[PDB]
Amino acid sequence: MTTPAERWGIHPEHFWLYGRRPRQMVEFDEKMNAWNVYGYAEAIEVLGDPGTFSSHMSRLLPMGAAFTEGDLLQTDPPDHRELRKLVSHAFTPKVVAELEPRITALTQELLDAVADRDTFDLMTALAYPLPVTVVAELLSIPSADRHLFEGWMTEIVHSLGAPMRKMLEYLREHAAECRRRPRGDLMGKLIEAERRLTDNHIVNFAKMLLIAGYLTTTMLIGNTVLCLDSYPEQAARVRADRSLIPGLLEESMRFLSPVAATYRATTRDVEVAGQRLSADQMVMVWFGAANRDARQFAEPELFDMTRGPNPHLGFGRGIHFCLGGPLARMEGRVALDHLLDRFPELYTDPERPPTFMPGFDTTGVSSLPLRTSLG
Numbered sequence: 001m002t003t004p005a006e007r008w009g010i011h012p013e014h015f016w017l018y019g020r021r022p023r024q025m026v027e028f029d030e031k032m033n034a035w036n037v038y039g040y041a042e043a044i045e046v047l048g049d050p051g052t053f054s055s056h057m058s059r060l061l062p063m064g065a066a067f068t069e070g071d072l073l074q075t076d077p078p079d080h081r082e083l084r085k086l087v088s089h090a091f092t093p094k095v096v097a098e099l100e101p102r103i104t105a106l107t108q109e110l111l112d113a114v115a116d117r118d119t120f121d122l123m124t125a126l127a128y129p130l131p132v133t134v135v136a137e138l139l140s141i142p143s144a145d146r147h148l149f150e151g152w153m154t155e156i157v158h159s160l161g162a163p164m165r166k167m168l169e170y171l172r173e174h175a176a177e178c179r180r181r182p183r184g185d186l187m188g189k190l191i192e193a194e195r196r197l198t199d200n201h202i203v204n205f206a207k208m209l210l211i212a213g214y215l216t217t218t219m220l221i222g223n224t225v226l227c228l229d230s231y232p233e234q235a236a237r238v239r240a241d242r243s244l245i246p247g248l249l250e251e252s253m254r255f256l257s258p259v260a261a262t263y264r265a266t267t268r269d270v271e272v273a274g275q276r277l278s279a280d281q282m283v284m285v286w287f288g289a290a291n292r293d294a295r296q297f298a299e300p301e302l303f304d305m306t307r308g309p310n311p312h313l314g315f316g317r318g319i320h321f322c323l324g325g326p327l328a329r330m331e332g333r334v335a336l337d338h339l340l341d342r343f344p345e346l347y348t349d350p351e352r353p354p355t356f357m358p359g360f361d362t363t364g365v366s367s368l369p370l371r372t373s374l375g
């Protein structure tokens with residue numbers, strides 16, 4: 001069975017998508033000026049030692065100058081635990097269950113708009129519009145303004161290979177307005193914590209949460225549909241047994257990891273897998289490669305939606321593991337379950353092929369033209 005990567009030419013430089021094993025699991029990369037970690041055990045070691053492998057990437061900026069406080073992804077212990085503890089109750093299974101009906105209603109509304117189409121782009125119809133609502137609800141952003149965020153996000157991703165300033169100014173005004181009558185929501189918790197967090201900290205957290213929760217989820221949705229198109233026997237079984245959807249989404253994350261790598265900075269000289277890293281060097285931890293390591297996964301080149309256990313690193317591991325995982329799992333499940341209900345047949349179009357997000361550290365669909373019948 002031809003993989004999505006082979007069929008569509010996904011990230012030829014991500015050699016693990018093509019079954020090739022690294023020469024060694026830790027290796028220095030000249031173009032990025034960074035150490036790459038490709039192995040599962042080595043990724044676990046790096047992720048589990050934040051004292052040596054810092055997430056505060058500003059430490060690598062050259063002599064000179066830088067304000068990332070409030071961004072949990074950039075924050076090391078001891079502040080990391082304190083900031084995460086302040087916000088973590090916004091991400092629980094109880095919150096997931098409270099938001100699920102809203103996500104289901106929005107999914108059905110989005111599908112009504114395309115249900116009669118002969119062809120449509122899954123990404124524009126469903127995968128891009130859906131994931132803003134969760135982040136907007138967490139941040140108490142008015143329903144009126146959520147469209148702004150979809151536009152700004154996709155625009156900024158386009159520029160990278162105006163919208164960011166407008167988004168940040170909205171976020172600063174939103175922080176200032178939320179101080180007027182704070183409520184028992186996440187914005188209020190950020191405001192009330194006690195030094196205290198300033199609007200700069202709150203804007204950093206809000207920008208982080210949009211980066212973290214939007215396009216990742218979009219890619220998960222698109223990637224999973226792409227996998228169903230390439231593995232149609234598995235897709236038929238999913239359609240007939242929707243309890244397979246969660247394991248399908250986990251295998252999609254293992255096989256096409258939306259976050260292909262994260263970043264660390266060494267704080268000291270350190271040896272990993274026989275390699276001598278120096279202090280003040282960048283380390284890229286390639287979740288996508290670790291997710292193909294045959295020391296951990298049997299037949300890692302095969303897409304198997306019933307793989308279980310499936311301890312993939314698509315949501316990370318250790319202190320920074322994805323706080324949004326339960327929300328993302330729900331969004332993917334709701335999107336896929338209703339898509340399959342509304343379209344008894346879906347196919348890619350060899351004349352309008354899928355395209356992929358450009359970032360070298362991502363693995364995901366950016367456009368997915370589909371046909372709703374053959375003919």
Ligand code: HEM
Pocket residue numbers: 055072073074084091134209212213214216217220257258259262263287313314315316317319320321322323324325327328
């Ligand atoms: C399938 C979709 C998603 C993927 C693949 C994903 C991937 C990741 C990964 C790999 C990390 C760890 C990064 C690191 O350790 O350096 C992470 C962290 C994070 N993600 Fe996600 N994520 C997803 C969905 C979400 C959603 C929906 C939210 C918001 C609810 C979110 C918010 C975050 C936050 C806040 C962090 C930082 C956690 C911390 O610093 O402790 N993510 N994500």
Ligand SMILES: [Mg+2]
Pocket residue numbers: 054059060265266267268279280281
């Ligand atoms: Mg350093």
